[PDB]
């Protein structure tokens, strides 16, 4: 074997630098980058087309042998779940459900043409629908001045909804083309899991009132979940029993069917789309028993059979829906990129945030001309597509084809459909995300920092609106790194004999401390927020406090009473007469602070290091720096730390190098004192 | 000399760990900390008294020999500047100036008894006065229903001012006693410099309208500076010429006097208090020439001579001044701790944020009973106290004594005092902070990160209210560390022969790369926000892209066409027949990623590292980890990275250790292939 044997001299900073020569520093200029990426080679243009327009990329990669059956099953299940869930979001958004039908067909195909993620399901989303409904209510109130019909009111509501949807689409496209979308590098896996869980709880609390069959005022904004829950709880007295009863029966039936599908996962060739049987039996019972006026239950109502021509929305209303459209676009992009990243990490591939944002923005912008409200990623549909075995985006295309087949022919069958059934089917297909709470014990016993980031994201995202909840979750997520820096290892370390290794004294029982040597290590980049903490930790853990040493020297003195710079370290001037009565200690001649684990030095860090070196020299203690990175040396010579040229020799390439240099200097001092 | 000579075996993780034994892990329990700090020794109680009540600490340390003359001069100058500046803040706060006189005497003495900083000047501050005036206007408008006097209106204004001041004092005390104040570890030196500069510009723009002798509506809140400047500019047409003229003459006189004092700093024994001569000549000219009705200029008015008894403020109004008092307390504490830290770093000592907050809160709370509005640190007075040679807080006591001597006897002399003179003297004594702009070129050519943090703090603190401006300046200040992490060194490094040193290949011209070895180093803690960046940088800079290698192998294949886990690294299975037509490269057998510079590993980092190792093994490339810190090894074994026990041997204590281990494994493989 090749034994670890090296014979080199000491490599402090001056003696190492005198053996090295500076580069020629090859020219890396702005013009060199500028002329590149403009030659317009066929490969470059093909790559640009592939990145911007990805449908032409993976269609030749599609394989008929092993993808067709899975894609067909996934598309069938996606359409089956997309019908009533889309209707539910539509009737939640204070618009007729036919507009939800439009918003379930065009955007999916447009995202298939332009989107990157191949496993998420695109369509209407809950909190987007709540925002749209709140905007429409704020513009067009419940009572407006135009028998006693509401067609004009619904027309005004859909006009303002289309206006805010188009504004959100344009601003999303503008953000995407302006290279915004790098923030997808944020949104940590606990963070996105907590965000999706909070969104799920928001959907549950939003559709709880629709399950109960009670109509109340809609709440949008901060503290929306608690206000909605209070509104539901205050109106439980005014309740209908038959709608709640049928909702509970369909709830139990769907829960039993899902448990049966999970229990018999090995037996059936594919999971049967029980969500279609559920809705068809629900509408059959509603039509047969005629609950719409016998019990006066809420019904989704008549469904037009049309494919209305494109229309230009109302631009003039953009002036009042600035912040609303901004919030809608931010939340939609965040949810879409969150679910895309989650599914990509689940499978193994990757998604592009910029491409997702551009595709979503242009999709919303074009679909707004098609009388469709704002879209996002449907989390429940995305998980069920992942579970059933989705592999491509053509499952969404099949879902859109099924939606179209319903619209043109089957649309009049759902006129007698209770909204409680839609609410309950949304809850049962959303119950699959409440199993994402299983990471809480997965994070408690394992990396509690992920636990607290998950809790912070979930709390700030549930009890507060998503548009500010996610930005504050990201803020505390990134300040978590700051906190982790502010609590370093702070370990004093020695060495075990006849080795280069230097390990914590409280680690392994044979790393004997070198007598007279104290080595302090920090696992932090020692910037302003922890420079004083580092100084205090060094003064405490190593047991060498310069202020305490000076105080002890002064009290011993009073007890016994009855350009050229000065040297950094002054020798002890107290004679043996005064030194007879002293609190004698180990009297370490040097302390070395290795900088192998630091990343950079801040200006406050430079000042703290300089004053530390000055204080220890005033006491009479040499201070050496071990293993400073070239960036750290650059940050030191950047400031006025190296104004005194007699500080370049306090720098050492390694801890062992610093220890050996201290030993050599001690031997030289002893030889000079003797000889 | 002691040459660096070591003879030790290879120290990969298993062979190193088998030579070490785990601790007994001495008991560090909660109860051990709990019983400590409750024995109530005389030293402990004395230290608690010293920390909470510091006036008893440094009074015995006061020396009559070298402090008396400097303290007397500093106190004289502080009182001289405190008189008209305090009057100006009072008449800006929509309250009679006598209340500013009260707010210039009691709080200074109370802070002397309780405050820690020994060089800052305590009194009224501008933006605090703007907030108080805005609150008083919002509660009591300009036109209220109670000849045609305003004494009742002024009484209501001072009542609401005292109420909000007391609320700010109580909440400041509550924050201080609740150990809040650790945020003083933030507020970097560029950040506090920019904050003070923005505050100075706010004072200038606020008192510009008072210099012009025009009365407009007061603006408080976000974008206050631009609104105030627009209000001043729109009313330059409605102007008086005599007040502006006398303001310009006193401006020029004070500028000339300050330049003369600076030019003759060596000659005079002490800088003469020209601010007293200025105000006395101004009020003498105002009384003699009688401008109050000849030119109808603004006059500070009659000044009562009283020491009014303590009164209880209006508690019931607390319900409406929540956010206002919160902002006032936050801004006051921030300014005080900022100037305290700046002066402490200028001199060398340190200040306690918690003690400063407690002292300020209790000072404001008690002084609110004395008909005084909210206080803070006066920046201009603090700098002039620092410059004149302040050493103790008794200079503030002398300033308060001078203010009292003015109140009881000399108070009726300032009845005929134009407000333009007060505005101009504030500007001339505030011009000393506009020299703090000199750090902009000190930061451009030196550590541009400090430049951008300074610019961010100044912009967010000037063009936006201080209460949110400072919190957002802190937010971007702490995200600056995140950005600095997201742009690591990203250097591929080799070694120079016969040494342990490993240095960047683009550094010094003799660090020859070991053939078949690629070493990648990151100066970042490789968490979620830069894991993908690290992977891309490794795949790009080292020229080894596993996806590209697999693609090249597949294209060569198509060209030539006409629990027990599997081993991590699979041997190349392509025969020599297919290997004849290949894009042959260096074919590095290993790549080693040293973790000496990283601080921790995130869960996303663990996943990225695992998938990286898997991909490189699939290609057939060994991956080793060099110099992982014990925290990094703990973070790796924390996750499921070490589920496969054949990954513990990819860990090495040093880069040279990993290189030698790779060499030994290559030699063993060659020996096995041959023999």
Author numbering:
A (entry chain A), B (entry chain B): 13 to 158, 165 to 580, 614 to 726
Study text:
The mammalian outer hair cell (OHC) protein prestin (Slc26a5) differs from other Slc26 family members due to its unique piezoelectric-like property that drives OHC electromotility, the putative mechanism for cochlear amplification. Unlike other members of this family, and unique to membrane proteins, prestin functions as a voltage-driven motor with rapid kinetics, likely providing cycle-by-cycle amplification of sound within the mammalian organ of Corti2,3. For members of this diverse family, known structures are dimers with each protomer showing a common 7 + 7 inverted-repeat topology containing a core and gate domain; these proteins function variably as coupled transporters and uncoupled transporters/ion channels with a range of substrates.
Here, we use cryo-electron microscopy to determine prestin’s structure at 3.6 Å resolution. The cryo-EM-derived structure shows that prestin oligomerizes as a dimer, with overall dimensions of ~10 nm in diameter and ~8 nm in height. Each prestin protomer comprises 14 transmembrane helices (named TM1–TM14), a C-terminal cytosolic STAS domain, and a short cytosolic N-terminal region. Seven of the transmembrane segments (TMs 1–4, TMs 8–11), are referred to as the “core” domain and the remaining seven helices (TMs 5–7, TMs 12–14) form the “gate” domain of the structure. The N terminus of one protomer (residues 13–75) crosses over the STAS domain (residues 505–726) of the opposing protomer so that the interface between the STAS domain and the N terminus of the opposing subunit is the largest in the dimeric assembly and buries a surface area of approximately 1438 Å2 (19% of contacts). In contrast to the previously reported SLC26a9 cryo-EM structures, the cryo-EM density for the IVS loop resolved in the prestin structure shows a more ordered, interpretable density. The angle between TM8 and TM14 helices of prestin and of Slc26a9 is 57° (for prestin), 61° (for Slc26a9, the intermediate conformation), and 67° (for Slc26a9, the “inward-facing”, open conformation). We speculate that our cryo-EM prestin conformation, showing a narrower opening to the cytosol, would explain why this protein shows reduced ability to transport anions in comparison with Slc26a9. Despite purification in high chloride, we were unable to resolve a density corresponding to a chloride ion within prestin. We reason that our prestin conformation solved by cryo-EM represents the contracted state of the protein at 0 mV.
